[PDB]
Amino acid sequence: GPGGTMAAEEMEKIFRDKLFHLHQKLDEAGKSAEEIAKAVELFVGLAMRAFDYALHIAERGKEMGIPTLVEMGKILFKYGAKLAAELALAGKSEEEARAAMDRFLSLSDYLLERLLPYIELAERMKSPALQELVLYAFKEGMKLLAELILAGKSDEEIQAKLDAFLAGFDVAFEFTLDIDVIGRELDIPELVEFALEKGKELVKLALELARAGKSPEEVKAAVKARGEELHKEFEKLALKEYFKRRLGL
Amino acid sequence: GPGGTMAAEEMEKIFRDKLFHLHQKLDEAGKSAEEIAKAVELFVGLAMRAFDYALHIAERGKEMGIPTLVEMGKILFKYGAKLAAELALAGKSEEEARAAMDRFLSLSDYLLERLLPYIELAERMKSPALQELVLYAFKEGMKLLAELILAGKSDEEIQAKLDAFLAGFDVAFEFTLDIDVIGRELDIPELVEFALEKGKELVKLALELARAGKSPEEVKAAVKARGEELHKEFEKLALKEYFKRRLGL
Ligand SMILES: [Zn+2]
Ligand SMILES: [Zn+2]
Ligand SMILES: [Zn+2]
Ligand SMILES: [Zn+2]
């Protein structure tokens, strides 16, 4: 639109894109005109609520000193619009779609509350890598939450899976922070890149374990083992880069 | 004249115009004074009945919340006055002209009852394009009905033709609604204009097929094929407009 916010324009673009591709999918599926109209109106109804909630999150982030909350609200709206598109495409009635959207928003708030301290710690140390890791973890959690809500699961199983995912993310965050501090102090960008990449890998492993139904302890143990292997790789890379710098290479 | 209502003034103007041009046509044809007088009185007698019928229909529409019924009553009066003018020009006696006017009024009521649910559905979705489509369909139906009544056809062939025309109009309405919903939700007026234009084209095709004497199934099939072609054209236009909007063009 002509007059809006820097975060509202991106969400409007996402909404238009999702609406266009939802119409494309409905046309491909070969539905009647009234069914297409019902699906479009249902999608607009759900996406309006998702837009309101994400805009509230982004505004709350803008009021305080956390630029990460704006990006995380954008991620939330993207995945809420995605969930709304699948809800409209599946032919769910209005009541079930509204209930599913409410549960999705509540569980996204749960993940928000659990992830805020990591954002504060990352922004205290001025580490872009840690902020990117938190963004990636939120994105993966949103993916898992949307898939679980689509599959029709209870609010307790989803919370347990989120708890296991956060248990894994704690270890991933510790690994990334440990590598990134020494990478920034020694002035070697390769170490920071390695930290970010291997932290993303650890977050992916934690999410995959959480989806499989493992308890938080199992996720913690497996992520710790993978982090130990990646730490050996980091030791090798750090030695190589340090001796590249030391010899003038 | 003075006073009256908003809808009766336009009907009075139509009546005066038709009377004036009927007198011009009678003078051009070179008829005797008594023949001109009898044609004029016959036309006035038929047009008064048409005026009363259309005024009722318009009043019934105004009492409810359907502005479309007023416009369709005006359309009915216009074509009833046209039929009366042709009947007076042909020199038919009062009995045959009165019977023909009666049959025309009954068949216009038949078409009105068949078209009412589409008006209700269009008003429920608040779609000006669908209301315009219904108005156009009623206008074409009145044209065909006047032509058939002038041609001297029974009250069975006319009903069969009307059913075929309505069978085509169902597909035309579905196509127009399908395009119009997505055009309105994405806020692209070109899509709504395309919907209206191609729905009018489909209605014209359905009327042409009904005039030729085809069964409703053949009309349905042909209108469906033409709608598929127009749907491919709509897909092209929608992609072009969406990429114009997305790129800021
Ligand atoms: Zn709000
Ligand atoms: Zn370390
Ligand atoms: Zn009367
Ligand atoms: Zn379509």
Are B178 and A37 spatial neighbours (Cβ–Cβ below 8 Å)?
yes
Are A111 and A138 spatial neighbours (Cβ–Cβ below 8 Å)?
yes
Query: For A187, which DSSP code?
Result: T
Q: What is the dihedral of CA A234, A237, A243, A244, to 10 degrees?
A: -140
| Nearest-neighbour CA in chain B from A41: distance (Å) | 9
Question: How many angstroms from the chain centroid is the CA of residue B106?
Answer: 15
Mention every residue, 6+ apart, whose C-beta is less than 8 A from residue B231: A27, B175
Please name which of A155, A166, A174, A62 lies closest in space to residue A111, comparing C-alpha atoms. A166
Ligand nearest to the CA of B51: 3
Quick one: which H or E segment has residue A12? helix A6-29
Are A159 and A107 spatial neighbours (Cβ–Cβ below 8 Å)?
yes
Neighboring chain B residues of A32 at a CB cutoff of 8 Å: 174
d(CA A142, CA A104): 9
Phi then psi for A32, rounded to 5 degrees? -70, 165
Q: Which two tokens stand for residue B198?
A: 């191609």
| Nearest-neighbour CA in chain B from A134: distance (Å) | 30
- How would DSSP label each residue in A46-80? HHHHHHHHHHHHHHHHHHTT-THHHHHHHHHHHHH
Neighboring chain A residues of B181 at a CB cutoff of 8 Å: 33, 36-37, 40-41
Please name which of A126, A130, A120, A138 lies closest in space to residue A64, comparing C-alpha atoms. A120
Query: How deeply is A44 buried, as exposed, middle or buried, from its count of CB atoms within 10 A (0-12, 13-18, 19+)?
Result: middle
Are A171 and A224 spatial neighbours (Cβ–Cβ below 8 Å)?
yes
Phi then psi for A31, rounded to 5 degrees? -110, 160
Q: Which single residue is written with the structure tokens 């996406």?
A: A47
- Give residues 140 to 179 of B whose Cβ lies within 8 Å of A: 174-175, 177-178
> Which ranges of B91-215 does DSSP label H, i.e. alpha helix?
94-124, 128-151, 157-185, 189-211
| Nearest-neighbour CA in chain A from B238: distance (Å) | 9
Give ∠ CA A56-A61-A62 in degrees, rounded to 5.
Answer: 95
d(CA B172, CA B137): 10
d(CA B186, CA B177): 14
Please name which of A101, A100, A79, A73 lies closest in space to residue A18, comparing C-alpha atoms. A79
Q: Which of B178, B242, B245 is closest, CB to CB, to A36? A: B178
Distance between start and end Cα atoms, chain B: 54
d(CA A63, CA A56): 11
CB of A6 within 8 Å of a chain B CB? The answer is no
Instruction: Please indicate whether, in this complex, the C-beta atoms of B186 and A16 are within 8 angstroms of each other.
Output: yes
Are A14 and B244 spatial neighbours (Cβ–Cβ below 8 Å)?
no
Quick one: which H or E segment has residue A178? helix A155-185
Mutate which of A12, A16, A21 to test chain B, going by most B C-beta atoms within 10 A?
A16
Mutate which of B182, B230, B239 to test chain A, going by most A C-beta atoms within 10 A?
B182
d(CA A16, CA B187): 10
Mention every residue, 6+ apart, whose C-beta is less than 8 A from residue A15: A47, A51, A81
Is the Cα torsion angle B220, B221, B224, B226 positive or negative in sign?
negative
Instruction: Please indicate whether, in this complex, the C-beta atoms of B182 and A36 are within 8 angstroms of each other.
Output: yes
d(CA A214, CA B141): 69
For B122, nearest residue in chain A (alpha carbons) = A34
Q: Which of A13, A37, A44 is closest, CB to CB, to B177? A: A37
CB of B125 within 8 Å of a chain A CB? The answer is yes
Mutate which of A15, A17, A18, A23 to test chain B, going by most B C-beta atoms within 10 A?
A23
Q: Which two tokens stand for residue B75?
A: 């359309």
CB of A20 within 8 Å of a chain B CB? The answer is yes
Mention every residue, 6+ apart, whose C-beta is less than 8 A from residue A27: A36, B231, B235
| Nearest-neighbour CA in chain B from A172: distance (Å) | 38
Please name which of A156, A17, A31, A26 lies closest in space to residue A77, comparing C-alpha atoms. A17
CB of A28 within 8 Å of a chain B CB? The answer is no
CB of B29 within 8 Å of a chain A CB? The answer is no
Q: Which two tokens stand for residue A53?
A: 């909630």
Q: Which two tokens stand for residue B113?
A: 């009852």
For B125, nearest residue in chain A (alpha carbons) = A37
Q: Which two tokens stand for residue A240?
A: 């190589």
Distance A54 CA to ligand 1 centre (A): 9
d(CA A78, CA A52): 12
Query: How deeply is A8 buried, as exposed, middle or buried, from its count of CB atoms within 10 A (0-12, 13-18, 19+)?
Result: middle
d(CA A107, CA A109): 5
Q: Which two tokens stand for residue B68?
A: 């479309």
CB of A16 within 8 Å of a chain B CB? The answer is yes
Please name which of A152, A249, A169 lies closest in space to residue A207, comparing C-alpha atoms. A169
Are A138 and A122 spatial neighbours (Cβ–Cβ below 8 Å)?
no
Residues with CB under 5 A from ligand 4 (ion): A 27; B 178
CB of A32 within 8 Å of a chain B CB? The answer is yes
d(CA A208, CA A238): 29
Are B44 and B76 spatial neighbours (Cβ–Cβ below 8 Å)?
no
d(CA A1, CA A13): 10
Q: HSE, CB side, 13 Å, CA atoms: give it for residue A229.
A: 8
CB of B122 within 8 Å of a chain A CB? The answer is no
**How many residues does this entry show for chain A?**
249
CB of B185 within 8 Å of a chain A CB? The answer is yes
Please name which of B168, B173, B232 lies closest in space to residue B205, comparing C-alpha atoms. B168
